[PDB]
Amino acid sequence: QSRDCATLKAAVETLVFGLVEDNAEVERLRRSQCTMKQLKSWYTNNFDSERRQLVVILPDFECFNASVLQDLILILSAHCGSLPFVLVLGVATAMTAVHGTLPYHVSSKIRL
Amino acid sequence: MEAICSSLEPLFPCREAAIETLGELIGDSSETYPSAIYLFGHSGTGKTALTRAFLKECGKRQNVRTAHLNAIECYTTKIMLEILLDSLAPDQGDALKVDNMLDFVEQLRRQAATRVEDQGFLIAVDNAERLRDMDANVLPVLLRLQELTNLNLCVILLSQLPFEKFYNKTGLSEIVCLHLAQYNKAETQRILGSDFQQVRNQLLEQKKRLEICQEAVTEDFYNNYLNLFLSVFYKACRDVPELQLTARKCLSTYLEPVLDGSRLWRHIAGPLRSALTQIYMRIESLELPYYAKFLLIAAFLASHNAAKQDKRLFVKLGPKSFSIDRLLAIFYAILEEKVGLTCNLLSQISTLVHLNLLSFVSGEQNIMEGSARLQCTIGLEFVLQIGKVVGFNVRQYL
Amino acid sequence: PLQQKLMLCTLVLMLRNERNKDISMGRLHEVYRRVCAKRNILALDQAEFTGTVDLVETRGILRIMRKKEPRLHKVLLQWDEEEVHAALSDKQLIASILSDTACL
Amino acid sequence: PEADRELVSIRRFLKERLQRDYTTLRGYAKERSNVRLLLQRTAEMGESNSLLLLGPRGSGKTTLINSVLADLLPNKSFGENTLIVHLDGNLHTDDRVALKSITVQMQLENAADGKVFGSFAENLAFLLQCLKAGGKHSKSVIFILEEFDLFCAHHNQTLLYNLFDVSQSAQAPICVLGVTCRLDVIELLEKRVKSRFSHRQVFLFPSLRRFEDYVDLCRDLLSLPTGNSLLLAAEKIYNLQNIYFSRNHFDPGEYGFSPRLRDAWNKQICKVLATQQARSTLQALHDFDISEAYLKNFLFRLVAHLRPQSPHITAEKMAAVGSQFEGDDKIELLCGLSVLELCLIIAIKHHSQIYDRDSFNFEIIYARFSKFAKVSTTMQAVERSIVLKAFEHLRIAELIMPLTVQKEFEMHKLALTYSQIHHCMQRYQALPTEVAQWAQS
Amino acid sequence: TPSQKMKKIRAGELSPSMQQRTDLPAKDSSKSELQLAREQLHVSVVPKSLPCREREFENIYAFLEGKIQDQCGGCMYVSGVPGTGKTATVTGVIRTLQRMAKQNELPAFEYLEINGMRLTEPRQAYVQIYKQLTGKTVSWEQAHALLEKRFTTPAPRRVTTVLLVDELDILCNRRQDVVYNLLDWPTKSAAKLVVVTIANTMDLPERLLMGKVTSRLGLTRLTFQPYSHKQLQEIVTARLGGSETFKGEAVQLVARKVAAVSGDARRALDICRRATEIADTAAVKCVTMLHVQQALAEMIASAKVQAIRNCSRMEQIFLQAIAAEVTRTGVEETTFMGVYQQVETIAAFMGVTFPPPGRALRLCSKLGAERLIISEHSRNDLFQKILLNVSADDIHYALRV
DNA sequence: AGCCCCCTCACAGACGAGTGCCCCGCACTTGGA
DNA sequence: TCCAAGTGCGGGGCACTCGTCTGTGAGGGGGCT
Numbered sequence A: 001q002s003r004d005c006a007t008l009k010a011a012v013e014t015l016v017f018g019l020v021e022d023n024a025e026v027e028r029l030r031r032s033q034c035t036m037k038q039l040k041s042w043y044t045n046n047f048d049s050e051r052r053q054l055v056v057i058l059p060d061f062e063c064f065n066a067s068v069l070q071d072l073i074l075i076l077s078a079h080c081g082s083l084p085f086v087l088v089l090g091v092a093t094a095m096t097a098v099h100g101t102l103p104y105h106v107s108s109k110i111r112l
Numbered sequence B: 001m002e003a004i005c006s007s008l009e010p011l012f013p014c015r016e017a018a019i020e021t022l023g024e025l026i027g028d029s030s031e032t033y034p035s036a037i038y039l040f041g042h043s044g045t046g047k048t049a050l051t052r053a054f055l056k057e058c059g060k061r062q063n064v065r066t067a068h069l070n071a072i073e074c075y076t077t078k079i080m081l082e083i084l085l086d087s088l089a090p091d092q093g094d095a096l097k098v099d100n101m102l103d104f105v106e107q108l109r110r111q112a113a114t115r116v117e118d119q120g121f122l123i124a125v126d127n128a129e130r131l132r133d134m135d136a137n138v139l140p141v142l143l144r145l146q147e148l149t150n151l152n153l154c155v156i157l158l159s160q161l162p163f164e165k166f167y168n169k170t171g172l173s174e175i176v177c178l179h180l181a182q183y184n185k186a187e188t189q190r191i192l193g194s195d196f197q198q199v200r201n202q203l204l205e206q207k208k209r210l211e212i213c214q215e216a217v218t219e220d221f222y223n224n225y226l227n228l229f230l231s232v233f234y235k236a237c238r239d240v241p242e243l244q245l246t247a248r249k250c251l252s253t254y255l256e257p258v259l260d261g262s263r264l265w266r267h268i269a270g271p272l273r274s275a276l277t278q279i280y281m282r283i284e285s286l287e288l289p290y291y292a293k294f295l296l297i298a299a300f301l302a303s304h305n306a307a308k309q310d311k312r313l314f315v316k317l318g319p320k321s322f323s324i325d326r327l328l329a330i331f332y333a334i335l336e337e338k339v340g341l342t343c344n345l346l347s348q349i350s351t352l353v354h355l356n357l358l359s360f361v362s363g364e365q366n367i368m369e370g371s372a373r374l375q376c377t378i379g380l381e382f383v384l385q386i387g388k389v390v391g392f393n394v395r396q397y398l
Numbered sequence C: 001p002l003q004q005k006l007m008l009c010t011l012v013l014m015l016r017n018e019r020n021k022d023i024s025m026g027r028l029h030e031v032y033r034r035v036c037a038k039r040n041i042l043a044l045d046q047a048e049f050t051g052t053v054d055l056v057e058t059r060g061i062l063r064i065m066r067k068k069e070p071r072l073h074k075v076l077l078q079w080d081e082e083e084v085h086a087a088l089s090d091k092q093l094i095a096s097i098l099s100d101t102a103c104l
Numbered sequence D: 001p002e003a004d005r006e007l008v009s010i011r012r013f014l015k016e017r018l019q020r021d022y023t024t025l026r027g028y029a030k031e032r033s034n035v036r037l038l039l040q041r042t043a044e045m046g047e048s049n050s051l052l053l054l055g056p057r058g059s060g061k062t063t064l065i066n067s068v069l070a071d072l073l074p075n076k077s078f079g080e081n082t083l084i085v086h087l088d089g090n091l092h093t094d095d096r097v098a099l100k101s102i103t104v105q106m107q108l109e110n111a112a113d114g115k116v117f118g119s120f121a122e123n124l125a126f127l128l129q130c131l132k133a134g135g136k137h138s139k140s141v142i143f144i145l146e147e148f149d150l151f152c153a154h155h156n157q158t159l160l161y162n163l164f165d166v167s168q169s170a171q172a173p174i175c176v177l178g179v180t181c182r183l184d185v186i187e188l189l190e191k192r193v194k195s196r197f198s199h200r201q202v203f204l205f206p207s208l209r210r211f212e213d214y215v216d217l218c219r220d221l222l223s224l225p226t227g228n229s230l231l232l233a234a235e236k237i238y239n240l241q242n243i244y245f246s247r248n249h250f251d252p253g254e255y256g257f258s259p260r261l262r263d264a265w266n267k268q269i270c271k272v273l274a275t276q277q278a279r280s281t282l283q284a285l286h287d288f289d290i291s292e293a294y295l296k297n298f299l300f301r302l303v304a305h306l307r308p309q310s311p312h313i314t315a316e317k318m319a320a321v322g323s324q325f326e327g328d329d330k331i332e333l334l335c336g337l338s339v340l341e342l343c344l345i346i347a348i349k350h351h352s353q354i355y356d357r358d359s360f361n362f363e364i365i366y367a368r369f370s371k372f373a374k375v376s377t378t379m380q381a382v383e384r385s386i387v388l389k390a391f392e393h394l395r396i397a398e399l400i401m402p403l404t405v406q407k408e409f410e411m412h413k414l415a416l417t418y419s420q421i422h423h424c425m426q427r428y429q430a431l432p433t434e435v436a437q438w439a440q441s
Numbered sequence E: 001t002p003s004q005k006m007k008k009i010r011a012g013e014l015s016p017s018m019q020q021r022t023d024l025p026a027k028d029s030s031k032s033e034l035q036l037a038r039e040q041l042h043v044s045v046v047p048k049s050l051p052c053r054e055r056e057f058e059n060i061y062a063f064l065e066g067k068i069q070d071q072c073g074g075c076m077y078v079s080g081v082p083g084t085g086k087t088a089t090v091t092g093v094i095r096t097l098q099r100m101a102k103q104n105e106l107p108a109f110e111y112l113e114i115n116g117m118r119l120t121e122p123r124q125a126y127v128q129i130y131k132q133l134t135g136k137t138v139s140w141e142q143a144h145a146l147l148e149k150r151f152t153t154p155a156p157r158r159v160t161t162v163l164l165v166d167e168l169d170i171l172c173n174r175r176q177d178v179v180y181n182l183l184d185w186p187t188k189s190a191a192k193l194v195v196v197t198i199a200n201t202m203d204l205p206e207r208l209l210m211g212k213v214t215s216r217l218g219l220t221r222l223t224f225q226p227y228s229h230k231q232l233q234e235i236v237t238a239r240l241g242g243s244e245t246f247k248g249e250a251v252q253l254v255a256r257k258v259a260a261v262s263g264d265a266r267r268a269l270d271i272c273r274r275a276t277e278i279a280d281t282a283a284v285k286c287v288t289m290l291h292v293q294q295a296l297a298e299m300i301a302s303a304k305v306q307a308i309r310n311c312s313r314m315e316q317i318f319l320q321a322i323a324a325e326v327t328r329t330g331v332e333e334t335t336f337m338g339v340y341q342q343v344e345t346i347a348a349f350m351g352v353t354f355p356p357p358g359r360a361l362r363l364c365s366k367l368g369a370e371r372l373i374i375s376e377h378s379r380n381d382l383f384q385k386i387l388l389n390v391s392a393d394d395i396h397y398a399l400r401v
Numbered sequence F: 001a002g003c004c005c006c007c008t009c010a011c012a013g014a015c016g017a018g019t020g021c022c023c024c025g026c027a028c029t030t031g032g033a
Numbered sequence G: 001t002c003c004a005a006g007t008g009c010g011g012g013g014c015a016c017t018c019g020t021c022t023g024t025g026a027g028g029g030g031g032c033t
Ligand SMILES: Nc1ncnc2c1ncn2[C@@H]1O[C@H](COP(=O)(O)OP(=O)(O)OP(=O)(O)O)[C@@H](O)[C@H]1O
Pocket: A105, B011, B012, B013, B014, B015, B042, B043, B044, B045, B046, B047, B048, B049, B050, B159, B160, B191, B240, B241
């Protein structure tokens, strides 16, 4: 949600905490130790033996900050190959807003 | 050092001299490494993939301990040092504790070994231009980590900027600058023609059509197709991945008269110039309420007109700034329906703000007091489309 | 001391012969260097001149507004010029510096 | 084969001499003597001293400290009576981190194999209590503070006030050597810390301003030494390793060269450095930077070219690495741009030439570009979207900088001179005729 | 183990010892007379009686003897520039009073001392005073509660406790409660506290203290004037003794050159030690005028002209162009663009070609690390600001001559 | 005969040091087990 | 012999705060067709 993603640090903590607590709900760690290192260790510990995708739902795409969104897309695109990420969006207005709020270097790594 | 180059030359055509230079510098692990290497270029030049495959081959063939980062993940230094010490000192578990740079330097000093096993360490920090936007004592320490830790390590940095943007007030150490030049048209044609075998296997694995598809899909035909493609798309972009992902689709369009039984430049030059308008879009009618449409065109008329021009029209150098009372006055002037001021209209103003169709150029904390300013961020053709689906001509009030 | 007397002399000279009251440490040092070069007195470096001004600051004659770099610190005189003339008690020197306005 | 293994051994010897070998200096017959006599009179008599090595970044400051310590520590009267505490301004970025490092390195009673207990105040009280309880019958502590101005930028300079208070008191005979690059570091101190500091300063300006000393240094850095010199150097390095750098040091006892190979290599090095092209390359490098790290970087990148196909060092390789150094990087980024970004840069150059370095926009530059694109007959039907993406590509490579609103109405600045664009117009490959005609007018 | 070590350190039961030398220290007979003058000129060796600090000694001794023999408590404020015999005179007065209280000439007392520049926060003063009362380290709130229980309540026979507070200006914070508590306890009748505070600035009670704190601090001030030319020769000639190692004009020139800059005694006692160390290397036994002049040149150093002489060629061209741009456009804060334009003009004049701005930014960063100029981060190239940190005449003196 | 165009001055914003406050980890630890 | 959870306390993140600094919107002042 856009309300819990004011900074990049809070958005990464919200993402890793949401994935780990989705795992704990389907089958408590503090938010200080919610990083991509712990997420990669947990995904290598649990789901490598079976691929389970990691879906990141963004319901309000327009209400997000621009810089936090671009750094989040670059973070999720940096970790592909090791963690299977699928991204869906919730864009309300049109596709021109998507192509306008995403710069050249961010849209270089997008297959929408 | 030649085995790594011989293993990297098939995977990276037309990248010969960079692989030879990186095999001179950090090729063999018995020789000492330079203090820091900084190779840079444009987007799509192939530096993340090149150093990633180079680090994988060095960790596979020799006794080095590689590491690969990304400096957008490292918003503070502790995460960066924990990832570095997980990669450089493996299989330690959750009992790895790094508080600052000093504990990291001591725990790397503990990894020193003898002079017979010929060990090395290799750190690659992708998106290095963020390293100058953090706590300011990570860049010189990353430059002189070989002298500090007294190890045989090299710190590789990857960015799109030259190194002239990295100097601070306190100064930096010495670095080995390396440039990855972008390809011209012939080398881009060779790179786009490298995947001819995968193209032929994909067109074989998907019947007189397939039997005629096997006889003329060959190397010279694909070379003429890539020549006709690069004769029209090289003007806009020189980047390899966009050209690959677009040349695949234009090839799938290009082949259909040859499979349906010059002779081909017009039939593709229609859709090639139709697809040049679809470059830089990676894609594989906006409905609004009535009063939201009128509020949107009233905000456009408030942003596109001067304050002194409103008195002549309504009485009966970007967009300008305006307050909410000006928007409401222009809306009730151009409405000619004279509805009341309810909750839903100001709620429509607020949800037009939250749809990024308006903005808050200033104020934004005293919105109720009236000192907040707005700014309309739409063009002219959407305003005229809204005015056509409503029936209100905006070409008069401009 | 002698160098503190010379610093106070050049500060009183710069506050007499110049309207705006923003006096940095670098401008005061560059006037003081010419004043010492005319008097055949061995001038100090900037790194010792800053310590000299900081030692005159303890008496209460000056007040230093702090900036980012030590050349930019603002020196504010907080006395009257007659109090400085009474405190220095070097009348043949302090009347010779304030008449030597060629260094400003 | 055997002619390849000699070249591999020569290249390995030269690279491990250029990168490693932290304890050998060249020159400084007075400064090294002053530092050595100061540390020796601290260790022997038990006097407390303060010192401040000053010099430019790139001279032998750390090498001088390592050479003095490597010549003093195997004395068995220095290494048994003294203990050395190294602190760095880049790693110890606070007061409590440096204080826990002092408490670990001095082996105090609350050390416990590298995990200090108590707070910052208890560590400070215990360190001052263990320093006050000493005298002239106690071990001498030698504090070595590198990046001294970063220690000057701490809270109240309070650690510095303690480190200069034991030096001016009847306590354990410490000796504080600061090593910094700022030539005006003494103006950052408070007046009490200024008073407690003994004002001796050692200046380490390099003695290779004249070009012949640069040529003799570049000749001494490439030549192979004899056998007896390598035995003596391996003896000294083994003596300082018997009792930190020495775990991974040069140690040249592993390499033994034939005398005919050494004489052929030194004859080739003198023959190459006696030419005019090599001296012109070294003259350009000496005009730029007379530092030692610049020449060692150039020599490392020249020695790394030694392959068994082209085994000898020639003047043409030196000229090639000199042209690798002397070239520009923003011009090499400018010739990698496509034609749309290049015509946008020409439109920006025209707007900045007309309006005399005024801030521009996307709409102004797009209007000036579309005034040309409608009559270009090769860039006729390019939209606003591709030009906006090309403007973003210019914005992310920092050829356009923001003045520090929408992205299409944000003001900007051109971050290039006009000579760089004029050279980009000459070095561009396959530039069409219309763009070259529009660039000149 | 951690637990018993912390419980025995915090309770003050183990000796905080320091390691001993394996080799025994040297003898006094093995030292030469120049070595004896070098060890007797140390700043650590305080004499048993201070020369030229007699009037302030009798002032503080009369004040403290009156406050001890009256058993009433009070406050004093001494002030002066660093190096002028403040703490040495105060501890000499306190040692004299302790020796008089040993001989049953004076009523006995306790002596507590704190320094504000070895405390991490001012509230740790409460931890230190109590540590000089009992020996046990506690938290600051419990130590403050125990000090308030000790001082405000009457308990005969209470002994007088003289509290010395060095570096008072560090105990001053936004709230000013520590200095208020230290200057407030003498104002009670049950607490026989006599506090003497030492500071550098003469106007500390008016500049940063509140009104009640400067009302409680009193008006019995004291000022330590700096050393003149005549007293700073007497100090060194009393330190050296009857040895003929230092000539008269050597000590006279040292005192005249030091007493004209600051009036510090540490500066003279370090310049004389450096002159002794210089004359040790010349294989002589006396300190002439030449070694003193060489030590005066070395200690009071000015090496911003040798640094410009020892720069490269392009950095001298860069400094000439920054000076010419400052001369042209009047104002001192320049931009890198006009600096590079004047660089190109000067390099066209001299004939040598200049590197592109990608290396001129490296030259500007190298001059900024050396603090010859003042420049920003290089992320805003061709628009960064440049101040000339050296004087514009130093460049002309370093390049013409 | 109300209107057209500069002046300017305390809010708006930034920003930057800088300093105190509150949450949070974390050993102590202790009366109990 | 140990121990579960309160708890006492230090440390870092954060938020206010004082001073500086600069745009600037609209009230105010001088001319107008
Ligand atoms: N010489 C080459 N031969 C074959 N493929 C190449 C070559 N150069 C690049 N590529 C292709 O380009 C891709 C590499 O993109 P990469 O991740 O390196 O972009 P990048 O350099 O990191 O750009 P940015 O820094 O802007 O993200 C690879 O998938 C590779 O197939």
